[PDB]
């Protein structure tokens, strides 16, 4: 099983991590039933 | 392959349902027979397992 | 293609033999084998006998010695001796196939034959 939390919150801080609590809901479980070693991350580019 | 052959040599068409039962989950199940709600009496409820 | 007939009937003194035929067309009559099946008006199906290539005769428990069933293979066909008609042996029968690699299902399945007894 492969679950995924997810947790949005609006927050003002410029730099770091803000300092707080809050509980990650159960968003999604995949029935995959594969290894998983290693992940990476997908960003876009901005073109002008 | 003929319309005009006789039972035996007419084409069949045959698809093979075979199972697996290994460690992985079970995401194959049987359909789910919801009945209706009863409620206010002592029975005996399965809600989702 | 696949076709079975059949034979014998009609309305008849109680206690007098018949004998039903089932002819078989468009199939190999090996590898298959043979029953006779009957039915009686407001009542639903009863199993009657089977047959195979050996020549091994199964009845139903519930009649007995009231029916003889014989198979022959150069024609292709199948023969059903019935001795002591009662009265309540009127019903519709109706000869049945299954393969003999495989599961109980009867597939195809004869038009019926009609036997009435009577005094
Ligand atoms: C998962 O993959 C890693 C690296 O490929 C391997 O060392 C590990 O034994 C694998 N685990 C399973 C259960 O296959």
């Known amino acids: 099983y492969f679950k995924i939390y997810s947790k949005h919150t609006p927050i003002n801080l410029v730099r770091d991590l803000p300092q707080g609590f809050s509980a990650l809901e159960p968003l999604v479980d995949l029935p995959i039933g594969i290894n998983i070693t290693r992940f990476q991350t997908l960003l876009a580019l901005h073109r002008s | 392959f003929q319309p005009t052959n006789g039972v035996g040599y007419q084409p069949y068409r045959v698809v093979v349902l075979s199972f697996e039962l290994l460690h992985a989950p079970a995401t194959v199940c049987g359909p789910k027979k919801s009945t209706n709600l009863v409620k206010n009496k002592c029975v005996n409820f399965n809600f989702n397992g | 293609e696949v076709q079975l007939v059949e034979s014998g009937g009609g309305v008849v003194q109680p206690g007098r033999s018949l004998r039903l035929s089932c002819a078989a067309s468009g199939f190999t009559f090996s590898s298959y084998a043979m029953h006779w099946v009957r039915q009686a008006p407001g009542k639903g199906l009863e199993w009657i006998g089977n047959?195979?290539?050996?020549?091994?005769?199964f009845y139903n428990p519930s009649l007995k010695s009231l029916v003889t069933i014989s198979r022959d293979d150069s024609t292709n066909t199948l023969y059903l001796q019935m001795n002591s008609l009662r009265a309540e042996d009127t019903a519709i029968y109706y000869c049945a196939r299954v393969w003999l690699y495989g599961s109980g299902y009867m597939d195809v399945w004869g038009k019926g034959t009609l036997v009435t007894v009577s005094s």
């Open positions: 047959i195979y290539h050996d020549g091994s005769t």
